[model samples]
Target chain A: EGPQWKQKALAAAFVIGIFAIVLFPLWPIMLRQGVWYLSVGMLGLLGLFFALAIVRLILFCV
Target chain B: LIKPFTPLLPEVAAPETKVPFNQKLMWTGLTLLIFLVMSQMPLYGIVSSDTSDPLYWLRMMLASNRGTLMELGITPIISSGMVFQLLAGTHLIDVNLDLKTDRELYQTAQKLFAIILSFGQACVHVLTGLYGQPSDLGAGICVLLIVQLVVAGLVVILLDELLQKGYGLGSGISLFIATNICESIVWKAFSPTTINTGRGPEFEGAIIALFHLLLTWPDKQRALREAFYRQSLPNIMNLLATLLVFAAVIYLQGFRVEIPVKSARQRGVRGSYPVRLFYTSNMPIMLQSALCSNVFLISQMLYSRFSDNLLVRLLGVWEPLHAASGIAYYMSPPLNFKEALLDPVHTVVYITFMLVACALFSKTWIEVSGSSPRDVAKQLKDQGLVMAGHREQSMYKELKRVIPTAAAFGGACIGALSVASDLLGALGSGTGILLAVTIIYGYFEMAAREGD
Candidate 1:
């Protein structure tokens, strides 16, 4: 890791990307659950990728 | 000559401990999902959705959604890869064939080139009115757009890298290509929306279109013709043709000249050998598509900017959805049989060009795919395999002769297949059929290997 922050962010991006993916099956559940969203924010921003998926699916694919 | 580089060589994914197939699949799926998300990440306010972009045929091939972060798509990888290949092949660069260090350096250099070129392309795109007027946005936003594009290009690379790096099944590029084509196939087959024609609401799905056409044959001949083969868009005939071509390709894959490759990895008594193929397995078609796509992109921009210029006209011009005149006209893959039949000269030119390009591309890829006569001989020699001749020279010489023949045959086959499929108006296009066939076959082999 060249810089500590870079590594942190690199790892962070990977984690968030994966977290965003679970919402594929979790897309419908999220609206009802309130739910998976907080687990992200409570974890202090690990869940940034959750909204990323459906928003994209709607924007690009739709 | 064998000097090693950093711990990580950019293009060559470092060997990693193999994970379970299930995990690999999850990563692949996850990579695809993320790609979908990334594609939606549009450049601030540029909506290419409404633009008359002529490179629509390549949207799936390049894995790009125009006017978005996915705009650059795999342009960096392919554009840079092609550049370096020419350099390496032409001996412009002194790259030692067998040196690990050189390989590492080359891979790293490719990544770096891609980075530089990605930024360059972003600037060019913005400058050339690709992303709309520069003044439509602020200066800070301008820099942000470049940053966004370059960064997204990297992100695309990183995803591809990860997929190829044992973390996933198959390569990221292949995965993306497969995903894009599959999406289009599905969308074409089953889109729920309908267009409001002056006559009535027309179903989007090809199947629906056919159903509606057949269901109400108010204009029997016209409806029947439209049902089977719509000139402008895919129809029932195209769908059937796509399926027919796919099936034929799958069947033809079985007809290989088997160059038996028995390795230690082939533990069983199975006939675990490699080709004898024709056309390094349609790599030439890939090259032609990539090459033509580049032509299409540049010509579209030129046509948009300077339609009146003589040189530009020679390159072809896009009007609505067709490449009407110039070299680009011939370069454009024929969409329907009527267009093809209307221009017999063009039809002949297109077919000949397709065959030659596919053959050329395939011939070169023989070496790239590690199936060159020398490489195959080496591979066999390493595997403790020998030919019936029992002489090393004989084995290699025989293969050296055979491989070229196979490549010619393969190239011609792919060329013919595309022409036939296109003439019949195959859905997803001829290349689409080729990709579907090859990609599926690759996935099948990967699964088989994993199972083994």
Candidate 2:
């Protein structure tokens, strides 16, 4: 029996790839331009993304 | 109420077999790396020109990074954990730890509560226009900002759980906090960042500034004095205070009382049960700091939004420089000995609050955590150990006298010590310094055990 080697590979890729995308535009803005949000149509969008992603992550282990 | 969502709550599975020490270390290192990265990644879709930080004083203790993905830091988790702990401890919500299902459910519920708090606090910051006006941010960007924060918070929760479940050394929450405190101390002591404090360009770091001034300033005497006791930034005095406080904490760690005992199973075999002066350890101060930080958060939020409201004013009258009046002002420790004397009322209130709250928390924690004399006596009885000169039955009564007294008195002394450090203007803040020292000592102890 093998440890979850494939799963580890996938997890590794996921962390690296997603972090690269998210952080790519972050530092430039934070360092140069400065730090700096949406509203009801946006509120609905937030709830949908926030809840679904949160639920999926919570259910990841079991 | 939270039980309905228990099945869906996020959790990390405990390791079936003991994890290798090096692997655990790797996981801890990776987790810390991820946290640092997150701390640097600023939130998307906001104008962050506001130089006025709403919770500047609370930042070190909360481990928050202004305008970054870690803006909320471990605040949501800490707040939710304390709420659930108080609930279970007081039996406000019934929980039976003996039942495995019940225990698991309780844990899941707490996780859910923390996640919800993450969502709630994000909403508060966004709706309050902490980034920018809702109108200015636009609908799309506002939604993205909230989603980004929610996910970041979820990542933090998982990281902490993973460490706690045996994939890492020590706790993720404590690790993050201690790291933040240590990082700030180092940054303040050595950072090369320059600022114009109206007196011309100066480095932000205390030590760096000292050398710069000594080397460049026209008046060496004036430079030396300014470097030692600068009002605008960290100075030699602040660094000295931090080192002194750290040394005091480590030295005091040696204080303990040992009770001689003999084992019935092995005739003449003797050992001693040691009760540390810090029997409750850093928990009392941690809890007290958590309470104070929460108050600061609430008061600041209210004052910013409704400065003219009578109720908000009663909570705090936030002046441009500091709290001017009300309960919040009184509860805040003075900056130095001079300030302490200038506002005797604030000093007395702060000192009394810290002492009473620490003692109360320490006493209650023992009972709730099942570390009371009764529990210890039961453990000793099972182990066939008895106090050297005392009857078997007298163990419980004898311990009953010592443990609670040690907890309350030691807790009060810790409070006094922390207050004294704060008055001296310790660099990492008094509570932050104490917590960092204790947490680092814990790490040292863990490494020593695992070294073999």
TM-score each candidate. Answer: 0.73, 0.77
What tens-digit string does per-residue lDDT give for candidate 1 at B235-297? 777688788888888888777666543334445333445454544665777778778888778
Q: Which tens-of-lDDT digit does each residue in B104-192 have in candidate 2? A: 87778677667767776777777677788888778888888889999998989877888887788888788888888888889989989
The 10-residue segment with the lowest total lDDT in model 2 chain B: B1-10
Residue B253 accuracy (lDDT) in model 1: 78
Instruction: Give the C-alpha interface root-mean-square deviation per candidate.
Output: 15.3, 10.9
For candidate 1, what is the DockQ? Answer: 0.01
**In DockQ, how does model 2 score against the reference complex?**
0.02
TM-score of chain A, all candidates: 0.36, 0.35
